[PDB]
Amino acid sequence: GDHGSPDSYRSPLASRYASPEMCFVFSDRYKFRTWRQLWLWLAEAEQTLGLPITDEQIREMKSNLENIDFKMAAEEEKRLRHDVMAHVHTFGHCCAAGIIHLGATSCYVGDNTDLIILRNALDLLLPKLARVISRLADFAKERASLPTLGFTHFQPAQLTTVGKRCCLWIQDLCMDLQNLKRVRDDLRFRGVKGTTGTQASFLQLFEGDDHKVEQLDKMVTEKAGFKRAFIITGQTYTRKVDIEVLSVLASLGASVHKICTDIRLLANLKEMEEPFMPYKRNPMRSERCCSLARHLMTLVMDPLQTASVQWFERTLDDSANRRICLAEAFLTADTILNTLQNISEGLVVYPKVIERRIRQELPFMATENIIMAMVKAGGSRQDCHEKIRVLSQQAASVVKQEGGDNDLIERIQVDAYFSPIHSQLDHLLDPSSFTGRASQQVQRFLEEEVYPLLKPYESVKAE
Amino acid sequence: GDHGSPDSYRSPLASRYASPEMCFVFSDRYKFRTWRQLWLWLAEAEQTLGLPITDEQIREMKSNLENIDFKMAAEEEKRLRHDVMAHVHTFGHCCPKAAGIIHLGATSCYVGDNTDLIILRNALDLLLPKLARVISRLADFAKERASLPTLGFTHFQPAQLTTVGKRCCLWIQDLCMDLQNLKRVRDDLRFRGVKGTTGTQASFLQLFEGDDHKVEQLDKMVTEKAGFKRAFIITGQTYTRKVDIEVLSVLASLGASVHKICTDIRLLANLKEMEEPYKRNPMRSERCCSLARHLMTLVMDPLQTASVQWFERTLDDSANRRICLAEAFLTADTILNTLQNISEGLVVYPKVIERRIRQELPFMATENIIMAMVKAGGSRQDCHEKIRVLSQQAASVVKQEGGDNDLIERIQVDAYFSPIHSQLDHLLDPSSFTGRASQQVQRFLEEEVYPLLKPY
Amino acid sequence: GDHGSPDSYRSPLASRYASPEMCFVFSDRYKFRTWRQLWLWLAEAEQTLGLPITIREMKSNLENIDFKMAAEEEKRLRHDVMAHVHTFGHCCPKAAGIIHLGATSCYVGDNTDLIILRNALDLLLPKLARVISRLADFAKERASLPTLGFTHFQPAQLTTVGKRCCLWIQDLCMDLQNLKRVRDDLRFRGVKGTTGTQASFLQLFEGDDHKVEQLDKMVTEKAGFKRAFIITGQTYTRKVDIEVLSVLASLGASVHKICTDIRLLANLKEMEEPFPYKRNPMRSERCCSLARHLMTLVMDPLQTASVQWFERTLDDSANRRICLAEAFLTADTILNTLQNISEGLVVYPKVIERRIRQELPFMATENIIMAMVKAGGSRQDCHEKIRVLSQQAASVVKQEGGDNDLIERIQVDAYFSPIHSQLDHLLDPSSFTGRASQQVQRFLEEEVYPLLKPYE
Amino acid sequence: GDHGSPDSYRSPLASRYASPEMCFVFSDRYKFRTWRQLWLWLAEAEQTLGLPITDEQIREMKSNLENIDFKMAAEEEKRLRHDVMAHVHTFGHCCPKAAGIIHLGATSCYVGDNTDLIILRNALDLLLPKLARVISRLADFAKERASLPTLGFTHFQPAQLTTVGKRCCLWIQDLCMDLQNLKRVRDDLRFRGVKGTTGTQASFLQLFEGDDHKVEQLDKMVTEKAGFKRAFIITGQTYTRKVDIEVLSVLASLGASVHKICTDIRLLANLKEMEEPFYKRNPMRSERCCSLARHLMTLVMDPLQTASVQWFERTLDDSANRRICLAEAFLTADTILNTLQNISEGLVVYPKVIERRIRQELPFMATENIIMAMVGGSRQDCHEKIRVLSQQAASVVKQEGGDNDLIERIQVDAYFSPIHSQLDHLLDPSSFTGRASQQVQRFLEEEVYPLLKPYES
Ligand SMILES: Nc1ncnc2c1ncn2[C@@H]1O[C@H](COP(=O)(O)O)[C@@H](O)[C@H]1O
Ligand SMILES: Nc1ncnc2c1ncn2[C@@H]1O[C@H](COP(=O)(O)O)[C@@H](O)[C@H]1O
Ligand SMILES: Nc1ncnc2c1ncn2[C@@H]1O[C@H](COP(=O)(O)O)[C@@H](O)[C@H]1O
Ligand SMILES: Nc1ncnc2c1ncn2[C@@H]1O[C@H](COP(=O)(O)O)[C@@H](O)[C@H]1O
Ligand SMILES: [Cl-]
Ligand SMILES: [Cl-]
Ligand SMILES: [Cl-]
Ligand SMILES: [Cl-]
């Protein structure tokens, strides 16, 4: 087992889905290395502020951040039924021992690690989402002027373009990118707060010096790479934070489910397919994204409920739930972005299928323009409307009652009434003349909104 | 290793929480051995109904149900991008004589769906006795404490006395509703059987040269081999994903029951009236609420999934079900194992309970005091007013001074209540305020609980 | 006015969606009438058990509800049940003293909610049965009409229009069984006192437990319920609300799936909702919209039950006013709308036929190979030859936007001369539907009609 | 009547809970007045950009924005089975000159969607001041009570003392995050504008005879008339239903905050340490807040599911759901904030009840400082001797239902002779509250007051 024995349950998010990078962020090695990192930082800062901590103690700790004895820690945890003290012991064993965790409570490691993990998990998602957006934007640009049947109520509607529709998709994902970046940036550090949030043990440690306590809190926050620490906590950071993070993943799920549902419907229509020659192909990656996106939406109710029933300075009914929902929300989001990147790399378009479908539907939407051209030729709008209405009903009935191709244009051609227009008919039915401002909209959107958001991710010159 | 390297995420449900039995039911070994079992049962039934399958082919399959080369299946899935096809191939590799007849006529869901149904039913069967055992233990506690008065709480404020056992029956009753729900869903679970790519059995009909009777026989025979009483007549490719709603909905409701019970226990621990088996934290109860919450959340997965299945099925159910079905059962198992341990060891502190009743009961006793004063030949009008002023004073000592409730002491030295003084002991006997609590416990256990547990 | 002024928010469920019958079940008039009806049943039973009571000015004033007075009382007391005892007592001067004799507020509040829930289920059941019956008529009508099967919303082994309708019918039949079980299993709260201990009643009957049990039996029987709880706190267990809204949520999932399928078939022009060029399946869209809210709402009672403390907390009350009515008014609307969709549902066989003509040839190549082998050809060779023609046809379709000409390519090819005479029969769509039509028949005879018989 | 007759279901959110102002924002009068406002603005802008619309047509529409014939609209809707077309016809009745130009070029969503956006923003602007007031009132209380020791609770068991004001800061902090969220969502809300049937503006482009600049300017002009800084460039028929998730998710999070705060107050009410403003009193307002906050949380699943299954340029399966969830979420949030303002206005505290509970629990928390004070004694010996006294004190409390007599046991014991002199001082409750008071002062100065300064009036 690197994901373990097949003789016991193994989470598919670990064993089947998420990237090894995100799997590692939520691994026990990452967690426990981070606990040691935090104890190292507490030591460093406690020394600076005058506590009795030698340079030598700080070096032996720094030298053993990664040398974690998991068999030992498991045995100690089993005996003490307390994970942090088990790790204090184990870290002391290879180390500095008497001053590890000096003055701190358990959440100094547990809760601050959770915050580092959440932020690092966001930092993994962000470039992946930007890559998907960038890949879709290339597609939108390429296909900006390609007419395609519009759909409202999934019924034929005013033509759009393949690239304009792709912009609906991109825009939602751009809102996600802004949301994730905001949440990542605004995440605050718990810091040093004590059992109930009052910093009592640290205040005793610093012999009543409130300013040394405030300095320590700022120092560990800065070492952890956070710009801001909470002033106010109970035992832990407010679980409202977990709602904020999972809500943004839930809304990302909704965007992806919509996008991948559209692609599935386009695949049925044979207009677009997932990246690669068999005649029948199933949109399995999009089906998978929808399946996983749904679980992201579902999971938002976990942190909403948890926060709602936290009592006072903390109840421990948050712990098991968070171990599952935070890790699994991010493993799920990771998988979805990885798959969606793959989807976005070489979407297959069939312009001749799209054209055929337009040829079958457009004439029903062209009748106003035909009416205008007759009236421009000095015809009667009224008479023309009545006549064209009857031809259209007849064409529609051939389609449904006979299962034939649409013959409206043929009907108009052999009708002498429309003789003043027969020479304009090809021009009047040119699909590019029905797509409104779709291509211009693509260009403006990409220039004004999409590329500026992508500029921090970019990662040839005139000479 | 067994649970994997510490360099990946490892589910807490596997490594921390659930029993080995439930973890085994949701293991890849059990899943794939069951795929092979289903292929064996298909071959046996098909041979019986006249298809060209040999005893040697059958013996080969039977001999290799557990002999699963997980490495080969992983490689072949990477190549084929199809999990069932990968396992058909892998099973044909260790069963070369049988290779050509494995999966004959079937679509992938034949093994996938039917195995999930077998797993769901077996998971229900592990839960049901554990739930019965929790109910039995709480029933014993309820009988033992049926007559033990305790302060009633409405709005979490002092109310008409109950008994420790009577309150316990609130917990038990919800859990009995859960036992009944789980049993009904278990007994009512139908097998998908043999249905074909779109549910029409077209492949099987062709194999049997248009003999509809043989197709129906095949469906009956695999169903019976699988230990199910009934198969669907109607399916698309999959069994209706409405089934997953039915199963996870009863688990969600069980989560709500547990969350409430364990909330009350956590409050009782604050009150120092009851504890789980000087600072002592109700951590098992906290863990149960925490996991019960997840059980409730998960119900939204199958509701959504079934709502957007298109036609004879879409594959957007598959990843989701891999996550939620196992998680729901592992979560439920864990709660019931933990609740078993809580139920085994509940400690009651009667002296604390009695102290609290003595602090609160005098304020609820004023009516009784009036009636005795009245029957002694006193003014219902005047006795109310006299007692009300003493009560206002006593209430101020409690809230304004943080003092003990001295309402009875007040009445004892007030001569207007002379007719009543001899009776005060008896007028404030907490046993006389519990209404029918203890009788309710006895009737409930005899009429409702014991009969439900008799089968376990 | 009847739905109020347009200058405030008015629920669309009342003003736009639900039937007047369902609206009236969740009306204040129905609610407060039932309060008085309960008060009459309480006084009647109390008299039969010998309390001091002679009932007719109560039975007189069941409908004579002075809403103006009651609102003034409630402002004054900030307690709805208190307000209506005073009001009913105002118009009932002869009985004011004996109204609510012994009871806590939940005697009217909670039992009325159970009466309302059961009456609401009783409005839904016939509606659901009727929809099922209409869909069954349609399934039988179209049992043999071949239609393109769909998995992943890609072409798959043919089904029939009627067989696909059976997928929809089955999910609804499960809903009908669920709704009937919950209706039949609903227990009355009866007479239970403030914390569930019947202390006030025990007192009233001077310690006679038997009479308290009898009273409880009597009011339950008067309310038309078979069974009361033995065990309650102040209220019936809010687990009941989970059981009810969960079955509604599952109904929403069924309906959302069915109406999604209809919307897809509407895009394909194979089906249309009953009678401009553009035809939109707006009733099916509305059903999906509302079904979605029905699934959403299950999280309300789940959360509520999970955080009820001890013998009850009042944080259930506002929530239940919203979610219970809304769930039933939503479900009423969906059933009404779905009935309307079923009535005149339009099928276009020639559209269905044309699409099968475009897709079936790609699924027919195995049968053509078999016919050629039978004519003494190589399986392998024939496969290669038909593969090249199939790729040509697929390119016409996807690369050129043409009609599928595979059958024509085979017809004009001399290699396939041994089966040219058989092609028309080899491509007969009815020969590709497997057991679809027989399954419709078996399902309707064994499962649907027996289920509907009781609703005849 | 005003909320309708008692013979039908009447939403309790209208009839029983929400403020009349929020009820008005989600009323039909407001909705259909706003549809008319949007039609007028469209006509003004189109006229300016050169379409054949006259001043008297504009004046006619302007004169009739409130003159809504609801009976006629209902009859038209029963006839047309379409709400926007019914209202176009009905407006055209009271505006006969303008009738032919009402809705020119627009699709139905031009009024429906833009009105919803105006409504969401106006609803957000009604909540924000209410939330600010709650925060202010709690901040006042937190400052007053900043140094009042009270038992800390983890796992709802005795823990290191906090203060009444510090604990209040937990509540205030969550609500400040809500205030920031609501403001953000409000400020970032974009207008749908003029987009056409599938969002391509084809109809407008043709009206302007192919002049893209005119189409772009029309969209800008209506957006500016509606008081929005920014319009979408990209839409289908509708604004993206992701917007509805963004708004209801912030409301759901506020529900979570409120549920937690009011759960704490209900627990304090049990302990008799704090009560809601004016012997047995029930925290019924806090209970109702929890009840409604729960519904606000539940509602988040509606928009999530809706957005997830919107096909292409839109499907109509959003419409009925949005009629219910958007109004209800806001009417629920309104009610909660109205009630919470009342709860926050005069919280009752009982210091002597608080003090007694601290006296019962603090000895068990003070044992470390006793050992420190003894340690010129022995850390090992003092710890073993103090342990047995704590076992004796704990069994009195639990097994015998008595008062905590640990301090007495120490006082009588000759061993602790050298510490008896300082025992009162060692058990001073203010010495156990850590930095609670200072944390409150810094929080209020740094984080809360600056957030509230924009709401001074
Ligand atoms: N106040 C606390 N803060 C942090 N961890 C705790 C606290 N109390 C107990 N624990 C430990 O945290 C872990 C919780 O386990 P679980 O419920 O499985 O997440 C166990 O090791 C507990 O012993
Ligand atoms: N119609 C089908 N029935 C069963 N399994 C399928 C079907 N189509 C594809 N699969 C396979 O099902 C698995 C789905 O993977 P996941 O989405 O990760 O659960 C993949 O290996 C697919 O190739
Ligand atoms: N124990 C109780 N049983 C029944 N109703 C109560 C109880 N306590 C208060 N009430 C009333 O129940 C109603 C709750 O209103 P709401 O929270 O708006 O549903 C109010 O009129 C309360 O005064
Ligand atoms: N494409 C559309 N855009 C806006 N409204 C529409 C559209 N199609 C239909 N409607 C109308 O929108 C309303 C939807 O009503 P409901 O489904 O009850 O919310 C009905 O009056 C419909 O006729
Ligand atoms: Cl700390
Ligand atoms: Cl099968
Ligand atoms: Cl009662
Ligand atoms: Cl528009």
The tokens of C351 are what?
């559209």
Helix or strand run (H / E) with residue A40: helix A28-48
Residue (of A75, A5, A64, A76) closest to A39 by Cα position: A64
Residues 6+ away with beta carbon under 8 Å from C407: C361, C423, C427
Q: Would you say B352 and B272 are in contact if contact means Cβ atoms under 8 Å apart?
A: yes
User: A269 CA distance to ligand 8 centroid (A)?
Assistant: 28
Tell me the C-alpha distance between C226 and C217, whole Å: 9
Neighbours of A423 (CB within 10 A): 9
Q: Would you say B274 and B348 are in contact if contact means Cβ atoms under 8 Å apart?
A: yes
Residues 6+ away with beta carbon under 8 Å from D127: D182, D330, D333, D334, D337
Do A148 and A193 lie in one domain? The reply is yes
Q: Would you say D387 and D177 are in contact if contact means Cβ atoms under 8 Å apart?
A: no
In angstroms, the separation between the Cα of residue D38 and the nearest Cα of chain C is 19
Handedness of CA B287, B289, B293, B299 (dihedral sign): positive
What 3-state DSSP class applies to B308? coil
Residues 6+ away with beta carbon under 8 Å from D400: B351
Q: Would you say D355 and D427 are in contact if contact means Cβ atoms under 8 Å apart?
A: no
Chain breaks in chain B following residues, C–N > 2.5 Å: 277
What 3-state DSSP class applies to B348? strand
Do A156 and A74 lie in one domain? The reply is no
> Contacts by A182-188 with C-beta closer than 8 Å and gap 24+?
A183/A122, A183/A244, A183/A245, A183/A248, A184/A119, A184/A122, A184/A123, A184/A126, A187/A115, A187/A118, A187/A119, A187/A122, A187/A226, A187/A241, A187/A245, A188/A115, A188/A226, A188/A228, A188/A229, A188/A230, A188/A237, A188/A241
What 3-state DSSP class applies to B50? coil
Residue with CA closest to ligand 3 atom 5 = C105
Tell me the C-alpha distance between B60 and B54, whole Å: 10
A280 close to ligand 1 (CB < 6 Angstrom):
no
| Residue among A279, A400, A403 minimizing CB distance to C394 | A279
What Rg do the C-alpha atoms of chain A give, in angstroms? 31
The tokens of D6 are what?
């008692």
Residue A8 phi, psi dihedral angles, 5° rounding: -130, 165
| Residue among D154, D280, D394 minimizing CB distance to B158 | D280
Chain D stretch 140-199, residues whose beta carbon is closer than 8 A to a beta carbon of chain C: none
Handedness of CA C23, C26, C30, C34 (dihedral sign): positive
Do A114 and A34 lie in one domain? The reply is no
CATH number, domain with residue A94? 1.10.275.10
| Pairing verdict, β D274-275 and D348-349 | antiparallel
The reply, when asked if residue B83 is annotated as ligand binding, is yes
Residue (of A440, A457, A434) closest to A149 by Cα position: A434
What 3-state DSSP class applies to B283? helix
Do A249 and A119 lie in one domain? The reply is yes
- Please state how this structure was obtained: X-ray
Tell me the C-alpha distance between C109 and D26, whole Å: 30
Tell me the C-alpha distance between D214 and D49, whole Å: 6
Q: Would you say D152 and A198 are in contact if contact means Cβ atoms under 8 Å apart?
A: yes
**Domain contains A299:** yes
In angstroms, the separation between the Cα of residue A70 and the nearest Cα of chain B is 8
Do C429 and C368 lie in one domain? The reply is yes
Tell me the C-alpha distance between C262 and C274, whole Å: 12
Tell me the C-alpha distance between D221 and D47, whole Å: 11
Residue (of A203, A198, A202, A196) closest to A236 by Cα position: A196
Tell me the C-alpha distance between A167 and A142, whole Å: 12
Neighbours of A419 (CB within 10 A): 11
**Domain contains A4:** no
Is B155 noted as a catalytic residue in this protein?
Answer: yes
As for how many domains chain C has, the answer is 3
| Residue among A160, A305, A314 minimizing CB distance to D154 | A314
The tokens of D68 are what?
């809504």
Residue with tokens 């029956």: B169
The reply, when asked if residue C234 is annotated as ligand binding, is yes
Do D372 and D386 lie in one domain? The reply is no
Domain that holds residue A65: 11-102
**Domain contains A389:** yes
Tell me the C-alpha distance between A255 and A252, whole Å: 5
Neighbours of C275 (CB within 10 A): 6
Tell me the C-alpha distance between B237 and B232, whole Å: 12
Which residues of C does the annotation mark as catalytic?
152
Residues 6+ away with beta carbon under 8 Å from A425: A409, A412, A413
B59 close to ligand 2 (CB < 6 Angstrom):
no
Strand partners, C346: C272
D8 close to ligand 1 (CB < 6 Angstrom):
no
Is A275 part of the contact surface with chain B (CB cutoff 8 Å)?
no
User: C151 CA distance to ligand 6 centroid (A)?
Assistant: 14
Atom number in ligand 4 closest to CA D238: 3
User: D103 CA distance to ligand 8 centroid (A)?
Assistant: 9
Q: CA D41 from chain center: how many Å?
A: 32
The tokens of A284 are what?
């399995």
The tokens of C231 are what?
């065990």
Last residue of a domain, one of A70, A102, A134: A102
Q: Would you say C426 and C439 are in contact if contact means Cβ atoms under 8 Å apart?
A: no
Q: CA B155 from chain center: how many Å?
A: 27
Do D175 and D244 lie in one domain? The reply is yes
AA identity, residue A220 = V
Last residue of a domain, one of A102, A125, A152: A102
**Domain contains B3:** no
Do D439 and D306 lie in one domain? The reply is yes
Last residue of a domain, one of C56, C84, C101: C101
DSSP of C36-50, one letter per residue?
Answer: HHHHHHHHHHHHHTT
AA identity, residue D415 = Y
In angstroms, the separation between the Cα of residue C296 and the nearest Cα of chain D is 6
Is D376 part of the contact surface with chain C (CB cutoff 8 Å)?
no
**Domain contains B31:** yes
DSSP of D308-356, one letter per residue?
Answer: HT--TT--GGGHHHHHHHHHHHHHHHHHHHHHHHHHHHS-EE-HHHHHH
| Residue among A2, A11, A16 minimizing CB distance to B11 | A11
Q: Would you say C288 and C260 are in contact if contact means Cβ atoms under 8 Å apart?
A: yes
Do B405 and B276 lie in one domain? The reply is no
Residue (of A239, A208, A199) closest to D161 by Cα position: A199
Neighbours of B70 (CB within 10 A): 13
Residues 6+ away with beta carbon under 8 Å from B194: B42, B105, B106, B110, B201, B204, B215, B218, B219, B222
| Pairing verdict, β B274-275 and D348-349 | unpaired
Which residues of D does the annotation mark as catalytic?
155
In angstroms, what CA-CA distances link A265 with A190, A261, A274?
Answer: 47, 6, 12
CATH number, domain with residue A400? 6.10.250.1570
Residue with tokens 């049965």: C129
Tell me the C-alpha distance between B449 and B427, whole Å: 34
In angstroms, what CA-CA distances link B125 with B22, B121, B390?
Answer: 10, 6, 60
Say which ligand is closest to the CA of D291. Answer: 3
Q: Would you say C234 and C194 are in contact if contact means Cβ atoms under 8 Å apart?
A: yes
Q: Do A295 and B3 count as a contact with CB atoms less than 8 A apart? A: no
Residue D14 phi, psi dihedral angles, 5° rounding: -85, -55
Neighbours of B3 (CB within 10 A): 18
Is D294 part of the contact surface with chain C (CB cutoff 8 Å)?
yes
Residue with tokens 């506590």: A51
Tell me the C-alpha distance between C150 and C158, whole Å: 8
**Domain contains D5:** no
C-alpha dihedral (A337, A339, A340, A346), degrees to nearest 10: 140
What 3-state DSSP class applies to C156? strand
CATH number, domain with residue B329? 1.20.200.10
Q: Would you say A168 and D240 are in contact if contact means Cβ atoms under 8 Å apart?
A: yes
What 3-state DSSP class applies to D160? strand
The runs of H, that is alpha helices, within D346-366 are 351-365
Strand partners, C156: C149
Helix or strand run (H / E) with residue D161: strand D157-163
Strand partners, D150: D162
The tokens of B380 are what?
């219902």
For the annotated binding site of A, the residues are 16-17, 81-83, 105-106, 235, 288, 314, 319, 323
Chains near D with 3+ CB pairs less than 8 A apart are A, B, C
Neighbours of C137 (CB within 10 A): 13
The tokens of A245 are what?
């993070």
Which residues of A does the annotation mark as catalytic?
153
Neighbours of C425 (CB within 10 A): 10
Residues 6+ away with beta carbon under 8 Å from B15: B3
Tell me the C-alpha distance between A314 and D170, whole Å: 11
Do B216 and B89 lie in one domain? The reply is no
**Domain contains A1:** no
Residue C242 phi, psi dihedral angles, 5° rounding: -65, -45
Total length of chain D:
457
Do A325 and A451 lie in one domain? The reply is yes
For the annotated binding site of A for substrate, the residues are 16-17, 81-83, 105-106, 235, 288, 314, 319, 323
Do A352 and A392 lie in one domain? The reply is no
What 3-state DSSP class applies to D274? strand
Tell me the C-alpha distance between A64 and A59, whole Å: 9
**Domain contains B5:** no
The tokens of D373 are what?
């004070």
Q: Would you say B264 and B167 are in contact if contact means Cβ atoms under 8 Å apart?
A: yes
- CB contacts, 8 Å: D312 with chain A: 150-152, 154, 165, 262, 265
Tell me the C-alpha distance between A297 and D249, whole Å: 11
